[PDB]
Structure formats: structure tokens, C-alpha cells
Amino acid sequence: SIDPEKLRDQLLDAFENKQNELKSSKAYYDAERRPDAIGLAVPLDMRKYLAHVGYPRTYVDAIAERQELEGFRIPSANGEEPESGGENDPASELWDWWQANNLDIEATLGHTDALIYGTAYITISMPDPEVDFDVDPEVPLIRVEPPTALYAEVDPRTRKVLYAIRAIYGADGNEIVSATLYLPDTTMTWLRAEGEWEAPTSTPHGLEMVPVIPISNRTRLSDLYGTSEISPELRSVTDAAAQILMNMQGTANLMAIPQRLIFGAKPEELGINAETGQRMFDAYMARILAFEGGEGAHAEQFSAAELRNFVDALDALDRKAASYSGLPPQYLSSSSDNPASAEAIKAAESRLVKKVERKNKIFGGAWEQAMRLAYKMVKGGDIPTEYYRMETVWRDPSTPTYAAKADAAAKLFANGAGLIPRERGWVDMGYTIVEREQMRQWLEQDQKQG
Amino acid sequence: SIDPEKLRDQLLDAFENKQNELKSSKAYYDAERRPDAIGLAVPLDMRKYLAHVGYPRTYVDAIAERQELEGFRIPSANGEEPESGGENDPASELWDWWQANNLDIEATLGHTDALIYGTAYITISMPDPEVDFDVDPEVPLIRVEPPTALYAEVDPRTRKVLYAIRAIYGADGNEIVSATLYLPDTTMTWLRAEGEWEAPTSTPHGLEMVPVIPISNRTRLSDLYGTSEISPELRSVTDAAAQILMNMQGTANLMAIPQRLIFGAKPEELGINAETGQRMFDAYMARILAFEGGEGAHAEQFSAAELRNFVDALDALDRKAASYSGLPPQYLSSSSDNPASAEAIKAAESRLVKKVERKNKIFGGAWEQAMRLAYKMVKGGDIPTEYYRMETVWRDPSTPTYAAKADAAAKLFANGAGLIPRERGWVDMGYTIVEREQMRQWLEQDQKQG
């Protein structure tokens, strides 16, 4: 074993060296200045006019805008018809803790950092009402923290955190305000660190496991720790398009206009004020310049650069940015048409929808594990074995066409004589767990009227 | 512990220091003059003719105008029915305070500043008879204040507000008229600052917490304080398009015309007046000029500049501004096409609706907390456990499309024989929480009469 007072410092050194890596994908999402984005043809004084490109934000927030959790699901042990418990159902307690924590806000934020940096960390604890307020003391704290703060060391052999270090800098400083260490049997906090480390508070717990769960953006089994969603090809297209926009904007200032020359003109004959090298003339529209010069003298011009030559490359990179991201082509305007029918919409969104179903599946695993730790921490003892087979139920990622499903559900449920039971029609209409449990009240009240 | 006067000083300095940041986002929404917007080809006297670009205002307005609070939902006691009650039961009590304050106006404004600056503050208080207020005396006086008038300090360790201050400025001389300081113990005010402060008034609170709740535009967990909705790529495309409009408008004054020339002339041959360098000729239509010529004299032109060379760049930037903001393409006129059907509308708005539903959760969290402090301030004691599981309910951000839902809802209800209870059809039609209660009474009058 290792002494916590020294273990925290190797964890803070490991955490601080990770900040140097994940500063990279931040620069694409926030659209910070990058050397590779600067358009090489633009003169060195005009290179201050950066041209930031929004594809990484547009992809990452399109994957995050359409994830929502409807509730949890747990099998009955030897019974059947599980939802008949209602407010007594084992799944309704886990959803009650999800609501009491505001996880429908905290998780939809954390699913954004999990895509930007490739990982984010759920944490579990009991509230301490000596110091914490605006929280119900009966239910566990579940809190999600980004990899720019909480850091964790993961076992190469099995999916476990060995230990993790939580807390943060303050007042926009470089200096740490406080640190917290998680260990398989205790949590320790150094309540201040600004002048020097103040002596730690400590709180033991019976989990035999670290109360930190990584939401990790894995794609292969080969991804041990998850990876940023902003893939190398989408970075390369973002930087490629930023150079084209900047070179086009340089050209629109310096060269989108023909340059006018006269040869065989003596400057002292044209009347150039030689102390300044230039001559004013009145340039109202229909004036004719008559020149006295004739010694082979003539006017000629350099042609304008056509800005359309760069736009033909901007359009080509918009076909690449759409193709690699799998967004509908109308998200980036890579085609003129939007779809115009409930089937054609489902066709265009299909790859975005299947990418989001893959994310709902992967992040659902972390929420199962976090809810099992929250149960073990609150209820004590050990897990009722049905919770190892729990599931997460997520909202349909596709655009909600209402009328196209309302006709279909009404054809299938032909006034009770049809193909499906009433309750199955409600889940095909997409009414969430809490909405169906409320409709079971209104349907019973309507059955009193006839 | 801390002196309120030294704290007032130290955080009026922090409030004033923040204003130098906020002006960098105000300048894009108000369309103030910016160095980066001035197109470089335009001559230095013509650079007064600024072109201003409306993408930042268009995006922030389109997000702010679609969101509206429909009511508060508080979970019931045992029996799982949050529609149960009336007569000041929880959902109607909190909505009565919302309506009695006109927060349907104050929040519609405050969400705009929360998107422009990245934050705005909700202030909770009791009213008093000594100020000339026209307000209901037992309603909690809830107001919203911009970061240009209120500032607050947030605890990095657990995201509570530690402290806040208002500073209020006179229109003449731009100097402070009064300031108000918020602490968990009390609110204090210095009603004058003319030459120097008065001695402060003070009013204690039964809260354990500062009665100031930040609304913040939280983009992700690693964004601690919320950030301006006018992202760096939408700034970049706004300034890029302003430079093209400047240079195009310069070119429409200089060079949209072919400049015409003559070579091999002499002054006294054309009759040029030697005192002025000019020669009027009566230039009505179809007349022919005849010249002495000699010396190989001939007439020739510089070309006009083709103005569509800039319009091809204006169109390209109108595709990028639509791509980065996620507005429908017809909002910026990035194409002439328009959605012909209720499904085609859901396709075009798919990005904008989900971006507004993302804001409804993030700003909903602040309105839950503000109503929870207001209850604890009015009723005293401590909060009933159900208010920790409260949620805000919001209007659907989609354009209404009534007749497309009307027969979908009618075909699901099927005159009471169908798939859904009557009360659910009213929710899917989008009737608001207060508005459904009117129908729930007219239905009883119709049932009694018919």
C-alpha cells in the first residue's frame, strides 16, 4: 500500500501531464488559433485575420443534441408484468435519484465532454448536510466531472479504477484550490491548497471499489481508455477548409479587382507631385482621360483573381466534411435539397441516427455501473442480483414525425380488435416511461366516464 | 468575519473589470464598429462607409424567440399524478408567482442577455411598502439582472454562489448612483454614491444561501461559468462577410464603370482650359466626336470590375454562416428553396429545434433553483422533499403545424374507443398547462348540457 499524502502527488503529476494532451481536441471544438489553419498565401500582416471553421462543434453537438434517457429497466426475479409496481418498481427508485440529482442536465453536459476529450467521470457519494445545501439528504450525490478536473488510473487487466484525484484550480489561476483522493475503502480531501496543503478530512465507505465510473468514448475493444470523437480526418478537413477561407479572404482584399497600368508615361509630364509620388484627379463617372503622351504610350491592366476558383474547393471540402461526419447533407449545406417526406427524412438522418444509437449503447453501460454503485452505497449490504441485468431506455434519436406514426399505430390497434395490445402502441408512439405511467391514470379515469 | 465595506469595494472592482470582457460580445450583437470588419481595399476617406452584418443578432434572436415556459411540474404524494390538485397545490403556487411577477416578460428578456454575454442572474426577495412598488404584497419579488448590472462569485469546489453585488449607473456622466450587496446572512444597500456613499440599509434572510441564481449558457462540463452563444466561427464569418460588403460597395463607386482614355492628344488641340485641366462637351445621345489625331492617337479603356466576383464570395459565406449556426437555410437566404409540407418543415428545422431544446434544459435548471429559494423565503421552515424532483415544462420549439397534428390526434383518440386517453390528446395538440385546465372545465359544461 501507499501513503495518501504522497500518493496524491504522483496522481497530480499524472493528471497535469494529461492536460497537455486533451488541450489539443479542445482547440478544435472551441475553434482556438491553430498554426495548421493559417492560409499560407496571405501576407504576414494580414495573417491576423483568422478564419475559424465550425465542423467539429457541428458534428459533436449533433451527436449530443439528441441523446436523452427515458428511464431504467430491471427484470422481475421470478415474477412477471414488471411495470405493475409503478412507484414501487425497483426502476422507479433509480429514476427518482436521476431526477433528484438533475442528471438530465448534468449528464447531457457530460456526454458533450465525453465526445470532445474521449472520457468523462461519474462520481458517487452520500451528501454531507453540515456543508451542502439545495440537495435532498435522503438520496446519493451522483455528479459528473470532466477530464480537465477529475483524473483516474485504470487497471490494464480488468475494467476497474485503482484510484482517482478530483478537485480543481480557482479564480482562473494556475494554482490548485483543493484536492480530493478516492481509494477503494475511503475518500480524502485537502480542503485548501492555495498557500500550502491544509490537513485532510477523510470519509470511509464499504464498496470495495473506487466510487468513480468512466463514461469513455470507446470505438474498438482496442480503445482501452476511449478517444476524442473529433477524428483525424475531420480535423484535417477543418484545417484544410480554414486555409481556403483565409486565402479567399486575402484575395478579396488584394486581388478581386483588376490593377490598372500606363506605360510610356513620363511622371513629370502626367503632373505627379514628386514630393509624394502621386497625383489626384476627379473620378466622376463619364470623364475621359486625354493624355498628351504618344511615345509608344498605352494603358493595360492585370486581370482580377476570380474568387469562384476558391469556392469550387470550399464546396469540395463541404462534400468531404459531410461524408466523414455522417451528418445529413443539409446540415452543412453540401446539397441544395432538404428531404420532403417522412421516409426521405428517415433516409437522410439514417447514419446520424445509427451513430447516436451506438453512443446510447456505450454510455448506457457507464450509467448501469454508476447506478449499481449508488444502490450499494445507499442501501448497504450487497446487490439484488436482478440489477446485474438492468438496462437503460433512451429516446429515439430520429426526428419525431408524429402523423406518420399516429396513422400506423391507429391501424395496428383497431379499437382493441387489432394486432397489438394498447400499451405497445404507446411505446411505438414514443411516450416515455413516466408518460405511460401517467396515461395509465388518465385511461382509468376515462373508463369511469365510458 | 469579512468587512462588508471592504467586500463592497473589492467586488465593485471585480464587477468593473468584467465589463471590459463583455463589450467584446456586445459589439457583435449591437453591430458596433470593429477593426476586423473594415474591408482593406476601400480608400482611407471612404472607410467611413461601414457595412454591418446581422448573423450574430439573427442567431441569438432565433434561439431566444422560440423558448417559453409552459408551467412547473412537481411530483405528487403517493399515487403518481402531478396533474392532481388545484387550490394552490404546488404546480399552481409556483406558476402564480411566475405570472404575478410577469416573469414571462423578464425571462424572455433575460434569456437574450444569457445568450449574448453567456450569463444573467435571477434575484429573489420579499417586496416592501416603503419603495413605491405596484406589486402583490405577499408574492416573492423575483427579478432578472444582466452581467452589465449584477456580478457574483461562484465556489469552484461545489458551484454554489459565495457572494453577489448590483451596481446601478446614472444616464448622465456614467457614474454609480447606488449599489446592493448579497450575502447568505443578509442583503445590504448604499442608496447614494453622490461624492460618497451613505450608511447602508440591511435586511436579513432565513436562507442558508445567497438569493442570487446564475442563469448560465453552460456549453459543456469543462465550461465552468457559461460562454457567449456568438461562437468564434460565427464572429469570423460575420467579419469576413463585412469585409466583402465593404470592398463590393467601394467597387460600386470606383471601377463598376469602364474608365475611358485617349492617347496621342495635346491640350490646345482638344481645347483643354489651362487654368482647370478640363473641357466641357455637350454629350447628348448619338453625337460623334471628331479629333485631329496624328501621332498614332487612339481611344481605349480600362475594364469595369465585375461586381459578381464579390457576390460569389458573399454566397459562399452565407453557406458557412448557415452551416455554423444551424439555422434553416431560408433564414439567411442561403438558397431560394422553401419546405412545401409539414414533414419538410421538420427536416429544415431539425437543427434549430434540438438546439433550443438543449437550452430549455440548461436554463430550466436555474428556474427550478430560483423557485426553490423563493418558496423557502416565503413559507420559511425547510423545503418539502418533492421540490428537489421538480421540472420546468416548456413550449415545443417547432413551428405549430396545427392541421397535421389535428387528424393524427383525432385518429388516435377515435371518439374515446382509440389508443389514448382524452387528456393525452390535449398534450399532443400542444395546449399549455393553464390552458388545458380551462378545457377540463368546458368539457364538464358540455357534458352536463349535451
Side-chain angles (χ1 to χ4, degrees):
Chain A
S1 57
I2 307 173
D3 47 327
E5 188 77 296
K6 174 155 46 60
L7 190 278
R8 65 172 170 91
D9 289 354
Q10 71 168 40
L11 262 289
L12 287 175
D13 286 349
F15 165 45
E16 190 265 10
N17 86 49
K18 179 54 60 82
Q19 301 280 39
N20 292 340
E21 177 173 24
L22 63 71
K23 178 59 167 63
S24 182
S25 70
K26 201 195 83 85
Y28 285 88
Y29 187 90
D30 283 336
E32 308 282 21
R33 179 183 177 278
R34 298 181 304 289
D36 309 286
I38 288 165
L40 307 183
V42 179
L44 302 188
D45 52 356
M46 284 175 59
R47 284 182 184 187
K48 74 182 302 293
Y49 299 118
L50 297 177
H52 297 312
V53 173
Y55 311 150
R57 175 178 275 117
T58 297
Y59 178 49
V60 169
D61 91 351
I63 298 301
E65 74 188 3
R66 58 183 60 235
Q67 301 182 35
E68 178 171 283
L69 189 71
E70 304 191 355
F72 303 93
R73 176 192 294 151
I74 292 100
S76 187
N78 302 95
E80 292 301 342
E81 304 160 52
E83 290 193 28
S84 60
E87 68 177 57
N88 313 274
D89 177 346
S92 299
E93 182 168 24
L94 300 184
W95 184 250
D96 185 44
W97 300 343
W98 179 280
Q99 288 188 323
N101 277 279
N102 294 112
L103 288 182
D104 68 316
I105 302 174
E106 304 284 303
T108 194
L109 298 179
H111 298 165
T112 306
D113 306 75
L115 299 165
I116 297 165
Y117 307 119
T119 186
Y121 301 99
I122 307 157
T123 66
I124 301 95
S125 61
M126 299 304 293
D128 42 355
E130 182 63 13
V131 301
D132 201 9
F133 304 128
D134 202 13
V135 173
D136 191 328
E138 182 58 20
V139 305
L141 286 173
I142 305 173
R143 293 290 172 241
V144 194
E145 295 277 275
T148 65
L150 171 52
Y151 174 74
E153 286 287 342
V154 176
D155 169 33
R157 295 151 294 197
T158 66
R159 293 200 293 105
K160 303 191 197 87
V161 172
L162 293 316
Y163 24 68
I165 196 85
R166 205 280 291 199
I168 39 51
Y169 325 95
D172 202 27
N174 297 309
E175 297 177 321
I176 291 172
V177 161
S178 177
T180 294
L181 179 76
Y182 299 106
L183 290 162
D185 60 357
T186 194
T187 305
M188 295 177 64
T189 296
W190 295 255
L191 185 60
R192 297 185 178 84
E194 296 176 289
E196 64 186 322
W197 298 103
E198 188 152 46
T201 184
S202 180
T203 59
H205 53 266
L207 295 179
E208 195 55 34
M209 300 185 75
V210 181
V212 179
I213 297 296
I215 299 165
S216 59
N217 189 46
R218 304 182 76 193
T219 69
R220 286 80 51 98
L221 295 171
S222 300
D223 302 313
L224 297 178
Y225 315 115
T227 52
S228 178
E229 188 59 21
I230 308 166
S231 59
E233 71 287 348
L234 183 60
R235 296 183 197 191
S236 79
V237 172
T238 300
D239 296 335
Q243 295 179 11
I244 306 301
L245 286 172
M246 201 182 306
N247 296 340
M248 183 179 74
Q249 186 62 261
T251 304
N253 284 293
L254 295 172
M255 222 196 310
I257 298 159
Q259 178 62 284
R260 293 178 170 180
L261 323 172
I262 299 178
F263 289 96
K266 304 303 306 305
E268 69 280 355
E269 184 134 61
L270 273 289
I272 277 64
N273 179 28
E275 283 66 29
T276 66
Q278 72 191 350
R279 190 220 201 283
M280 309 302 173
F281 68 96
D282 57 302
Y284 305 100
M285 70 200 321
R287 300 303 207 242
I288 299 162
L289 309 190
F291 299 109
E292 274 50 67
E295 192 165 38
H298 59 281
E300 63 179 6
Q301 53 160 56
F302 296 122
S303 188
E306 44 165 350
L307 301 187
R308 177 267 301 286
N309 192 26
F310 293 102
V311 183
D312 285 349
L314 292 176
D315 290 350
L317 295 175
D318 275 338
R319 295 199 293 269
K320 265 59 184 174
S323 180
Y324 303 167
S325 309
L327 302 173
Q330 63 103 343
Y331 269 44
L332 304 187
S333 73
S334 311
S335 189
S336 185
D337 61 312
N338 58 265
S341 176
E343 300 303 308
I345 291 163
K346 196 177 296 292
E349 297 189 330
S350 59
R351 185 154 59 120
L352 174 57
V353 168
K354 286 282 172 283
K355 180 65 63 171
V356 179
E357 289 195 283
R358 175 70 165 273
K359 301 312 187 182
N360 288 354
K361 185 179 293 294
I362 292 164
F363 296 174
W367 289 115
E368 296 175 22
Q369 298 200 268
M371 288 297 175
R372 287 196 292 269
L373 293 186
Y375 184 99
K376 196 180 306 217
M377 193 151 192
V378 176
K379 243 69 183 177
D382 205 5
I383 297 301
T385 195
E386 312 320 319
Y387 283 67
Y388 297 113
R389 285 158 281 252
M390 74 181 286
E391 301 163 35
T392 46
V393 184
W394 296 84
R395 187 180 293 280
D396 176 352
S398 67
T399 37
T401 181
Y402 184 78
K405 293 191 299 184
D407 186 61
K411 279 179 169 72
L412 288 163
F413 184 82
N415 308 330
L419 189 75
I420 66 178
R422 170 177 274 126
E423 178 78 50
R424 191 70 187 69
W426 295 349
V427 41
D428 275 347
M429 288 302 303
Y431 305 126
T432 62
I433 307 296
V434 295
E435 290 171 290
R436 303 199 310 272
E437 183 63 3
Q438 194 172 26
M439 286 192 294
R440 289 191 281 244
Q441 319 309 318
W442 301 341
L443 187 281
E444 200 281 329
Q445 291 173 195
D446 285 356
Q447 283 181 345
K448 311 303 78 158
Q449 320 309 319
Chain B
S1 56
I2 191 161
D3 177 2
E5 295 292 352
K6 101 83 165 184
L7 184 56
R8 181 191 53 53
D9 285 341
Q10 189 258 316
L11 299 179
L12 286 177
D13 289 345
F15 166 95
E16 179 178 304
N17 182 67
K18 178 56 67 84
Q19 309 312 306
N20 295 338
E21 178 175 21
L22 302 185
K23 287 166 65 265
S24 74
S25 65
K26 200 194 85 83
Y28 285 91
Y29 187 88
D30 274 317
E32 306 283 16
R33 180 184 181 276
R34 298 181 303 288
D36 309 292
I38 290 161
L40 307 180
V42 180
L44 306 187
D45 49 6
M46 291 191 186
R47 284 183 184 186
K48 73 186 301 290
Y49 297 118
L50 296 170
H52 296 307
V53 174
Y55 314 137
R57 194 194 300 264
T58 297
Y59 181 47
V60 170
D61 287 3
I63 297 291
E65 287 172 353
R66 286 184 172 236
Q67 59 188 284
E68 168 168 286
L69 220 163
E70 165 175 309
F72 295 85
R73 197 201 318 280
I74 314 298
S76 65
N78 303 88
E80 189 48 32
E81 175 47 308
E83 296 288 329
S84 63
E87 197 170 24
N88 301 78
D89 280 350
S92 297
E93 184 83 319
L94 274 54
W95 184 262
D96 185 56
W97 300 342
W98 175 276
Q99 183 158 348
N101 279 287
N102 294 324
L103 290 182
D104 54 344
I105 298 173
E106 307 286 304
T108 297
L109 300 187
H111 299 159
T112 306
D113 300 64
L115 294 162
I116 297 167
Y117 303 125
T119 181
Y121 301 97
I122 307 158
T123 298
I124 299 94
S125 64
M126 293 300 291
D128 68 79
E130 300 295 342
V131 177
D132 56 329
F133 295 131
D134 181 26
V135 298
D136 190 28
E138 70 170 32
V139 164
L141 178 68
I142 302 165
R143 291 295 179 266
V144 188
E145 296 282 29
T148 68
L150 202 161
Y151 175 87
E153 283 293 338
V154 175
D155 187 344
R157 302 166 296 182
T158 190
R159 301 188 275 266
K160 292 187 298 180
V161 173
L162 295 171
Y163 170 92
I165 184 149
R166 284 198 300 175
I168 302 184
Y169 287 77
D172 188 15
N174 60 86
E175 184 170 37
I176 293 178
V177 167
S178 63
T180 294
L181 181 152
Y182 303 85
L183 279 167
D185 301 335
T186 186
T187 291
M188 297 173 65
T189 294
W190 299 250
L191 185 57
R192 296 290 177 169
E194 297 174 40
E196 68 278 330
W197 309 98
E198 64 154 23
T201 65
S202 180
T203 58
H205 308 302
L207 305 180
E208 302 296 346
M209 295 174 282
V210 186
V212 172
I213 296 298
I215 297 164
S216 59
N217 192 37
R218 301 297 304 291
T219 56
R220 65 182 186 257
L221 295 177
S222 56
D223 175 0
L224 280 298
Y225 310 126
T227 44
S228 180
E229 192 59 23
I230 310 170
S231 63
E233 66 281 357
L234 188 61
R235 290 179 154 122
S236 301
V237 178
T238 300
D239 296 333
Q243 292 188 23
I244 306 300
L245 288 172
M246 284 281 291
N247 299 351
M248 183 183 77
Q249 184 55 238
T251 309
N253 286 293
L254 305 174
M255 318 169 71
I257 287 305
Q259 177 59 70
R260 40 178 71 165
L261 320 171
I262 298 175
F263 285 92
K266 296 293 169 281
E268 58 268 31
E269 266 48 79
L270 307 189
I272 306 302
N273 170 267
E275 301 89 59
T276 60
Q278 291 177 1
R279 167 58 159 114
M280 276 69 72
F281 69 99
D282 45 329
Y284 312 110
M285 172 155 43
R287 292 175 168 205
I288 300 160
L289 296 314
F291 304 103
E292 275 280 16
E295 305 187 10
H298 57 281
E300 64 181 3
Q301 305 182 157
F302 295 117
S303 185
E306 304 297 325
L307 298 193
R308 79 193 68 82
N309 197 27
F310 298 102
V311 184
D312 290 343
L314 292 177
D315 286 350
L317 294 171
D318 284 351
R319 292 200 292 272
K320 300 311 184 185
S323 175
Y324 301 167
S325 62
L327 298 173
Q330 79 281 11
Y331 277 31
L332 270 57
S333 74
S334 310
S335 67
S336 60
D337 199 4
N338 59 97
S341 69
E343 307 307 316
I345 289 169
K346 283 176 172 279
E349 303 199 343
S350 180
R351 289 192 70 184
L352 178 56
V353 168
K354 290 288 165 195
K355 195 57 158 271
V356 180
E357 289 195 323
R358 172 62 165 262
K359 302 312 184 182
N360 288 359
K361 285 202 174 293
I362 291 159
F363 297 171
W367 286 116
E368 291 175 28
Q369 294 167 8
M371 287 298 173
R372 205 181 297 127
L373 294 190
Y375 186 103
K376 192 166 180 165
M377 190 161 193
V378 178
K379 278 74 166 71
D382 203 10
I383 285 285
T385 175
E386 317 310 345
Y387 291 90
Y388 299 110
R389 313 102 198 286
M390 166 166 49
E391 68 169 17
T392 52
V393 185
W394 298 85
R395 298 291 298 286
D396 178 341
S398 312
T399 193
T401 193
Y402 179 74
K405 295 204 299 275
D407 66 18
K411 286 165 61 174
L412 284 165
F413 179 66
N415 305 343
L419 188 76
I420 66 177
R422 167 173 275 131
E423 178 79 53
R424 182 68 212 197
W426 301 349
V427 178
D428 290 358
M429 288 305 301
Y431 304 133
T432 58
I433 287 168
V434 179
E435 180 173 29
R436 282 160 52 215
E437 179 55 30
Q438 302 186 274
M439 292 168 57
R440 207 178 292 145
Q441 296 171 24
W442 301 340
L443 188 282
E444 187 274 346
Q445 297 184 7
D446 286 354
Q447 184 278 343
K448 185 61 176 70
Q449 183 179 162

